[PDB]
From a paper:
Prokaryotic sodium channels, in contrast, are true tetrameric structures, composed of four identical subunits, each one equivalent to a single eukaryotic region. Both eukaryotic and prokaryotic Navs consist of voltage sensor (VS) and pore domains, which are responsible for regulation and ion-translocation functions, respectively, and C-terminal domains (CTDs), which appear in both cases to have regulatory functions, albeit of quite different natures and structures. Prokaryotic orthologues exhibit approximately 25–30% sequence identity with human Navs and several have been shown to have sodium ion translocation activity and one ([name] from [name]) has been shown to be blocked by human sodium channel blockers with similar affinities and kinetics as the human Nav1.1 isoform3, thus indicating the structure/function similarities of eukaryotic and prokaryotic Nav orthologues.
Residue numbers in the entry:
A (entry chain A), B (entry chain A), C (entry chain A), D (entry chain A): -1 to 91, 100 to 262
C-alpha cells in the first residue's frame, strides 16, 4: 500500500538511521552513568526514565518495521531478528541492558558488513578451530593425570586444567608462575609444556589469520555490491573470458 | 572379490564414518571422566569396560580395512599406519590412552586435509627452523659461559639456558624476572638479551607465517581435488596457455 | 618572480634538506642532553642557547617557504601546516620541545610517504576500530557492575575498568594478577574474561593487519609516482585493456 | 690452470660441503661440552685439542679457496669475507668462539639464500625502522623528564628510559610492574603509556611483516635462479608481453 511504502521509505532513509543511532548512543551513555555508585536517588531515577524512553522508541521502531515489511517479512533477515530479540527481552522483567549498544552494528551498514564478513568467514576455519579444541582436550586430560595430585589448584580437575592451559597458550606467567614451580616436582615437565605452547600458539595464529584473510575478501565484495550493485570478478574468471574470446576469434578465422 | 568390494563400500560410506567418530568421542569422554579422583570403584570399573568396548570396535574396524584393501595395501597410506600404530600400542600392556582422540583427525576428511597441508608445508620452512635452532644453540652456549656462575638456576648448564632463552623469546617475565636481576651483576647484559629477543621473535614469526601461507595454498588444492577431481591452475600457467593460443593464431595468420 | 623561483629551487634542493635534517638532529641531541640532572649551570645554559639557535633556523626556513610559495600557498599542504604549528607553538611561552624531532618525518620524503600511507589507510579500518570501541565500552560497563564492589581498584568505576580491560587485552598478568584473584570471589568470572580476550585480541590483530596491508599498497603507489611520475595499473585494469584490444581486433575482423 | 680447476671442482662438490658441515657441527658440539664446569682437566684439554683441529681444517679450507679462485677473487663474495673474518679472528690471541657455528649458514646454500633474502629485504623497511627509532627517542626524552625524579630506577636517565620503554613495548609487566605503580604518583600516566604501546607494537609488527613479505619473494627468486638458471617473470610483465603480441597481431592484420 501507499502508507506501507511511505513508512519503508522513511525507515530506509539516512535521517531515520541517524535518529536511531543517536538514541542507541544516548541509551549507552545513561547505562554507563548508572555504573556510578555515588549517584543520588533523583539522578538514578532520572537516568532510569531516560533508559525507559530509549527502549519505548526501539519498540515503536521495530513495530514500524514489522508493518512496512511484514511478519515473514522482517523476520527473513537475521539483523532484524537480532534487533527484535534484543528489544523484546528487555520487556520481560536479562540484567545486562548494555548489550543493546550492539544495535550500533546492525543499524550502521558499514559496521554490519564488517561483522557479516567475519561470520561468513567462520565455516571455512571450522576444521582448524576443531583441531585446537582436540589439542586442548587431549592436553587437559594429560595435565590432570600428570600434575593434578601435586598441583591441584592448577590441574586438580579437567576444568582447572583447561583454564591454566588457556593461560599457558596466552604465554601469561607460563614459566615463572606455572612450569618452573611444576618442574621443581616433575623435572621433565618442559617435554609437555614447550610442545603444547608451540602447537597452540601456532594453531591460534593460523585460525586468526584464516578469519582475517577470508573476512577481508568477503567484506570487499559486500561493500562493492552495496555501492555499485555487483562485485569484481576473480582474475581466473577474467582470464577464462579472455581465453573464450581467443577461441571465438580462432573459430571465426582460418575458415569463414 | 564381491565380499571385499561390499566391505570397501561399507568402510567408505558416510554412516560408517559417523559410527567410528561417535565411538572416538565416547572413548574421549570416558577418559576425561576417568581423570576424576572422587569416582567410586564401580563407576571407574564401568568406564574402564566402556573404554575396552571402544578399543575392541577399533580392532574390528582396522581388521575390516586390512581385508577390504590388503596388507600392502592399507599400509600404503600414512593415515592408516597412524590408525594402526595407535590401536596396536593399546593391546600391549603407553599410559596416555587419550592420544587415540587424535583419530578424529584421520577419520574426518576436512580435518585430515588441514593437518596434511601443515605437514606438506614443513619441508619449505626447514631452513628457517634450522636458523632458529642455530641462533638458540649459539645463544645457549654464550649465556652459560657469561651468566652460569652468577645465575646457575637460569644459566648453570646448557639445558637450563635453552629453557630460559625459550622463556625470554616468549617475552615471559623476560625483564622483571630475568634481565633486570642479571643486569644488577652484569650491567651490559641488555647487549645480549635485547638483540636475542629481536632476532628470535622475528625468526619465529617468519617460520609461523611461512607455514600458514603454504598450508593454506596446499589445503585449497587438496579440498578442490577431493570435490571436483582436480585443482585450479596458477595465473602464470593460464597466461602461458593464453600466450600459446596467441602464438597459434599468429602462425595460422599472415600465411595460410 | 626570479627571486621567488631562486628561493623555491634552493628549498627544493637536496643540500637544503640535509642542512634542515642536521639541525633537527642537533636540536634532538641537545634536548636529550638536557634530561641529564647532573649538568652544571653553564652546560645547561650552553645547550639552551644551541636549542634557541636551532629554533631561529626553523623560523627562517618556514619564512623562506611562505615567501617562495605563498600564504595560500604553503598552507595548502598538511606537511607545511604541521611544520608551521610545531615551530609557532615554541615561540609562545608546550613543555614537550622534543616533539619538533617529528619534523624528520616531514623533511625526509621516504619517511613522509610511509606516514601518509598509514594515515590514508585509517578511513578503511574505521568500522573495525569502532567495533573494538563498542566491545570495550560494553565490557567496561559489565565489569564495573559485576566486579566493582568486590575489586574497586580494578573495576570501581568505568575509567578503572577500561584501564584493566586494556591490560587484559594485552595479556599482561591477566590470569595470575587479575582473573585468578577475581575467581576466588566470582567462580564463573572466566565466562566473561576468556571470550573478552578471544574477541579483542582478534579485533586488534584484524585492525593492525588491515592498516599494514592498505598502507603497504598505498606507499608502493606514492613511491612510484614520486620517482617515475605515475603508478602501476591493477591486474584487473590490464586484463580489461587486453579484453578491449581483443574486442577491437574481433570488430576489425569478420567484416572489413 | 688444471690444478686450480681441480681444486675449484673439489671445493664446489657436495662431499667437500658435507665434510666442512660435519667439522662445524663437531666444533659446535665440543664448545657446548666446554660449558660444563664439572669436567676434568684431561677432558677439557682433549676438547680444546679437538677445537684446535677443527680450526686448522678451516684455515686449510679458506687457503684452498684463496688459491682456486684468487685474492680479488674469493674476497669478491661477502660470504667468503665473512668466512675469512670468522677464522682469521680466532688465530689472534674474541672469547665467543661459538660464533663460528654461524658458518653453517654460509656453507649450506639453502640457509645462505634464506639469510640473504632477509638482508636484501632490510633497505625496503629502513624508513619504518627509522620511524620506530624516532618514536623511541622522543618517548625516552619525555619519560626521563616526566618520571625520572619519582621513578629513577626505570626513568632516571635516557638509557634507563630506553630500556623500560622497550620492556613496555614487549608488554612485559607493563601495567602491574610499571604503569600501575607510576599512576600512584602521576594519575594521568596512562595518557603517555597506552598511546606509546599502541604506536610501537603497531610499528614493530609493520616492520616485521615488511621484512617477511619481501624476504619470502626475494628468496623465491634466488632459489629459482640457483636451480633453473632464472626466475619467474611478474604477472604485469607477462600481461605486457601478451599485450605486445596483440599489438603485433593487429599491426599484421587490417593491412598486409
Ligand atoms: C581454548 C578453550 C579454553 C576453555 C577454558 C575453560 C575454562 C573453564 C574454567 C572452569 O570451569 N573453572 C575454573 C577453573 O580454575 C571452574 C569453575 O567452573 C568452578 O565452578
Ligand atoms: C627453541 C628450543 C627450545 C628448547 C628447550 C629445551 C629445554 C630443556 C630443559 C631441560 O632439559 N631441563 C630444564 C632446565 O630448567 C633440565 C632437565 O632435563 C633436568 O633433568
Ligand atoms: C582500547 C581503549 C582503552 C582506553 C583506556 C582508558 C583508560 C583510562 C584510565 C583512567 O582514566 N584512569 C586510570 C584508572 O586506573 C583514571 C584517572 O583518569 C583518574 O584521574
Ligand atoms: C628499540 C630500541 C631499544 C634500545 C634499548 C637500549 C637500552 C640501553 C640500556 C642501558 O644502556 N642501560 C640499562 C638501563 O637499565 C644502562 C647501562 O649501559 C649502564 O652501564
Ligand atoms: Na606477558
Ligand atoms: Na605477549
Ligand atoms: Na607477563
Amino acid at each position: 500500500s501507499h502508507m506501507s511504502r511511505k513508512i519503508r521509505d522513511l525507515i530506509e532513509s539516512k535521517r531515520f538511521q541517524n535518529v536511531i543511532t543517536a538514541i542507541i548512543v544516548l541509551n549507552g551513555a545513561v547505562l554507563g552513568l548508572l555504573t556510578d555508585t555515588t549517584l543520588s536517588a533523583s539522578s538514578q531515577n532520572l537516568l532510569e526514565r531516560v533508559d525507559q524512553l530509549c527502549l519505548t522508541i526501539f519498540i515503536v521502531e521495530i513495530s514500524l518495521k514489522i508493518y512496512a515489511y511484514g511478519v515473514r517479512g522482517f523476520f527473513r533477515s537475521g539483523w532484524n531478528l537480532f534487533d527484535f530479540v534484543i528489544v523484546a527481552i528487555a520487556l520481560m522483567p536479562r540484567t545486562f541492558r548494555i548489550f543493546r549498544v550492539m544495535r550500533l552494528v546492525s543499524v550502521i551498514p558499514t559496521m554490519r558488513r564488517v561483522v557479516q564478513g567475519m561470520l561468513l568467514a567462520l565455516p571455512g576455519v571450522g576444521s582448524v578451530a576443531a583441531l585446537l579444541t582436540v589439542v586442548f582436550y587431549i592436553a587437559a586430560v594429560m595435565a590432570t593425570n600428570l600434575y593434578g595430585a601435586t598441583f591441584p589448584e592448577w590441574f586438580g580437575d579437567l576444568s582447572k586444567s583447561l583454564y591454566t592451559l588457556f593461560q599457558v597458550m596466552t604465554l601469561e606467567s607460563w614459566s615463572m608462575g606455572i612450569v618452573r614451580p611444576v618442574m621443581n616436582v616433575h623435572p621433565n615437565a618442559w617435554v609437555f609444556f614447550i610442545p603444547f605452547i608451540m602447537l597452540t600458539t601456532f594453531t591460534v595464529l593460523n585460525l586468526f589469520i584464516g578469519i582475517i584473510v577470508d573476512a577481508m575478501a568477503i567484506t570487499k565484495e559486500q561493500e562493492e555490491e552495496a555501492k555499485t550493485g555487483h562485485h569484481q570478478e576473480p582474475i581466473s574468471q577474467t582470464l577464462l573470458h579472455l581465453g573464450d574470446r581467443l577461441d571465438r576469434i580462432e573459430k571465426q578465422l582460418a575458415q569463414n
